[PDB]
Design an enzyme around this catalytic site. Structure first.
Site, PDB file in Angstrom:
ATOM      1  N   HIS A 160     -20.260  25.290  52.805  1.00 38.86           N
ATOM      2  CA  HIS A 160     -18.812  25.579  52.992  1.00 38.86           C
ATOM      3  C   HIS A 160     -18.333  24.880  54.258  1.00 38.86           C
ATOM      4  CE1 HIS A 160     -19.138  28.689  49.826  1.00 38.86           C
ATOM      5  NE2 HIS A 160     -17.882  28.220  49.580  1.00 38.86           N
TER       6      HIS A 160
ATOM      7  N   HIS B 260     -17.497  19.612  52.054  1.00 32.37           N
ATOM      8  CA  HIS B 260     -16.944  20.349  50.883  1.00 32.37           C
ATOM      9  C   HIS B 260     -15.419  20.183  50.869  1.00 32.37           C
ATOM     10  CE1 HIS B 260     -16.029  23.253  47.856  1.00 32.37           C
ATOM     11  NE2 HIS B 260     -15.406  24.022  48.735  1.00 32.37           N
TER      12      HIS B 260
ATOM     13  N   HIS C 174      -8.776  24.399  52.388  1.00 32.44           N
ATOM     14  CA  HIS C 174      -8.907  25.586  51.500  1.00 32.44           C
ATOM     15  C   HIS C 174     -10.054  26.498  51.942  1.00 32.44           C
ATOM     16  CE1 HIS C 174     -12.330  23.694  49.492  1.00 32.44           C
ATOM     17  NE2 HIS C 174     -12.571  24.863  48.882  1.00 32.44           N
ATOM     18  N   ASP C 175     -11.010  26.003  52.722  1.00 31.29           N
ATOM     19  CA  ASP C 175     -12.178  26.807  53.173  1.00 31.29           C
ATOM     20  C   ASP C 175     -12.263  26.834  54.707  1.00 31.29           C
ATOM     21  OD1 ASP C 175     -13.496  28.204  51.086  1.00 31.29           O
ATOM     22  OD2 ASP C 175     -14.457  26.365  50.406  1.00 31.29           O
TER      23      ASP C 175
ATOM     24  N   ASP D  68     -12.472  22.919  43.335  1.00 24.16           N
ATOM     25  CA  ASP D  68     -13.391  23.722  44.157  1.00 24.16           C
ATOM     26  C   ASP D  68     -14.791  23.705  43.573  1.00 24.16           C
ATOM     27  OD1 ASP D  68     -13.969  25.136  46.439  1.00 24.16           O
ATOM     28  OD2 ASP D  68     -13.791  27.070  45.360  1.00 24.16           O
TER      29      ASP D  68
ATOM     30  N   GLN E  76     -27.832  29.393  37.139  1.00 25.11           N
ATOM     31  CA  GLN E  76     -26.884  28.247  37.001  1.00 25.11           C
ATOM     32  C   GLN E  76     -26.352  28.190  35.552  1.00 25.11           C
ATOM     33  OE1 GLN E  76     -25.483  25.584  39.242  1.00 25.11           O
ATOM     34  NE2 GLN E  76     -25.656  27.611  40.177  1.00 25.11           N
TER      35      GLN E  76
HETATM   36 CL1  JXX Z   1     -23.687  30.342  41.105  1.00 22.46          CL
HETATM   37  C1  JXX Z   1     -22.644  29.077  41.682  1.00 22.46           C
HETATM   38  N1  JXX Z   1     -21.563  29.415  42.464  1.00 22.46           N
HETATM   39  C2  JXX Z   1     -20.684  28.482  42.912  1.00 22.46           C
HETATM   40  N2  JXX Z   1     -19.566  28.855  43.789  1.00 22.46           N
HETATM   41  C3  JXX Z   1     -19.289  30.310  43.646  1.00 22.46           C
HETATM   42  C4  JXX Z   1     -19.014  30.955  44.999  1.00 22.46           C
HETATM   43  O1  JXX Z   1     -18.237  30.131  45.880  1.00 22.46           O
HETATM   44  C5  JXX Z   1     -18.862  28.973  46.282  1.00 22.46           C
HETATM   45  C6  JXX Z   1     -19.267  28.154  45.076  1.00 22.46           C
HETATM   46  C7  JXX Z   1     -20.897  27.145  42.555  1.00 22.46           C
HETATM   47  C8  JXX Z   1     -20.019  26.155  42.947  1.00 22.46           C
HETATM   48  C9  JXX Z   1     -20.183  24.843  42.606  1.00 22.46           C
HETATM   49  C10 JXX Z   1     -21.284  24.495  41.868  1.00 22.46           C
HETATM   50  C11 JXX Z   1     -22.182  25.493  41.437  1.00 22.46           C
HETATM   51  C12 JXX Z   1     -22.006  26.812  41.811  1.00 22.46           C
HETATM   52  N3  JXX Z   1     -22.905  27.772  41.368  1.00 22.46           N
HETATM   53 MG    MG Z   2     -13.416  29.295  49.348  1.00 18.50          MG
HETATM   54 ZN    ZN Z   3     -14.354  25.874  48.439  1.00 23.75          ZN
END
Ligand code: JXX
Ligand code: MG
Ligand code: ZN
EC number: 3.1.4.17
Length: 315
Positions: free
Chosen positions: A68, A72, A106-107, A217, A269
């Protein structure tokens, strides 16, 4: 105003593609962002001196967390740049100005922890903002930086254009709260299917811009497999830290976030692509057909995680 940013040839061409990776050279990311603003918006959208000071203040207020982080921020702005470039005539001048800035911001000041972890910790931000805790903070941090002297990149807008763009940015940043994504996409699904989706209806635009924000995002899942896979380690490094911090509060974390249960990552995933990513890019592709490469790349990566599970490759 006769001062273009230009990029080496390989970047000049690849930056136009959804799956572009901004590279490991941090000192080029500001120039990549200005390049995208100049082509997406115009060389006149922003006073370059103000834009540069704003970019560097935003960078400074991203922290050194595994995922983050400033990289990003720029990555998510680049995905928005690609959507805007592939949907030239669908967005207002104010929207193009607002959304790249929204994405970069945004973050802001993210600490690598979920809204959930702040609520269980009883962080002061959880008292100040009961929902979308980090996202209301990110917007707060954006407004703070806009108000530093020399940093008002919007100062040439009228009073009411100023209010419109800050309102685009606030909705856009709030929409990155994945808890709001599910209902936003379900609504967009129904409106598209029953034929009521209307881009002149401001509340419909808001929804469509929110789903773009989710798409930008999550755009790690729309990269080539080697980028997707290496990014997943940064994502999981934050989750595992959170898991650790949950265990310190006396709370068994969900297994996704437990660094003792790394074996469960590939199946986790799969859930995420199936519950979140594929639905997101499907509905986005329905509303904005030129964004299909994001859906195609996401499907390719789902298939790459299926291969990790079938032991046909490893993590
Ligand atoms: Cl399990 C998971 N969570 C993600 N996001 C959920 C929480 O915010 C941060 C990101 C994510 C985001 C991008 C790629 C794969 C991802 N896999
Ligand atoms: Mg965020
Ligand atoms: Zn983000």
């Amino acid at each position: 105003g006769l001062m273009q940013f230009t990029l080496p040839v390989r970047l000049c061409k690849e930056i136009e593609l959804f799956h572009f990776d901004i590279g490991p050279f941090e000192n080029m990311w500001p120039g990549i962002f200005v390049y995208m603003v100049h082509r997406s918006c115009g060389t006149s959208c922003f006073e370059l001196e103000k834009l540069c000071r704003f970019i560097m203040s935003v960078k400074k207020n991203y922290r050194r967390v595994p995922y983050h982080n400033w990289k990003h921020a720029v990555t998510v702005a680049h995905c928005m740049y690609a959507i805007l470039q592939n949907n030239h005539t669908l967005f207002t001048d104010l929207e193009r100005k607002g959304l790249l800035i929204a994405c970069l911001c945004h973050d802001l000041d993210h600490r690598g922890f979920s809204n959930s972890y702040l609520q269980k910790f009883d962080h002061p931000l959880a008292a100040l903002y009961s929902t979308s805790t980090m996202e209301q903070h990110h917007f707060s941090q954006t407004v703070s930086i806009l108000q530093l002297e020399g940093h008002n990149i919007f100062s040439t807008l009228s009073s009411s254009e100023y209010e419109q763009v800050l309102e685009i940015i606030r909705k856009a940043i709030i929409a990155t709260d994945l808890a709001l994504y599910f209902g936003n996409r379900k609504q967009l699904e129904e409106m598209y299917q029953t034929g009521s989706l209307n881009l002149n209806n401001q509340s419909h635009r808001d929804r469509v811009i929110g789903l773009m924000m989710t798409a930008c995002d999550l755009c790690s899942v729309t990269k080539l497999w080697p980028v997707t896979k290496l990014t997943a380690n940064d994502i999981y490094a934050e989750f595992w830290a959170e898991g650790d911090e949950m265990k310190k509060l006396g709370i068994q974390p969900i297994p996704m976030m437990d660094r003792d249960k790394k074996d469960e990552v590939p199946q986790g995933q799969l859930g995420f692509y199936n519950a979140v990513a594929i639905p997101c890019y499907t509905t986005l592709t329905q509303i904005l057909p030129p964004t299909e490469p994001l859906l195609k790349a996401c499907r390719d990566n789902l298939s790459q995680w299926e291969k990790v599970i079938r032991g046909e490759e490893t993590a």
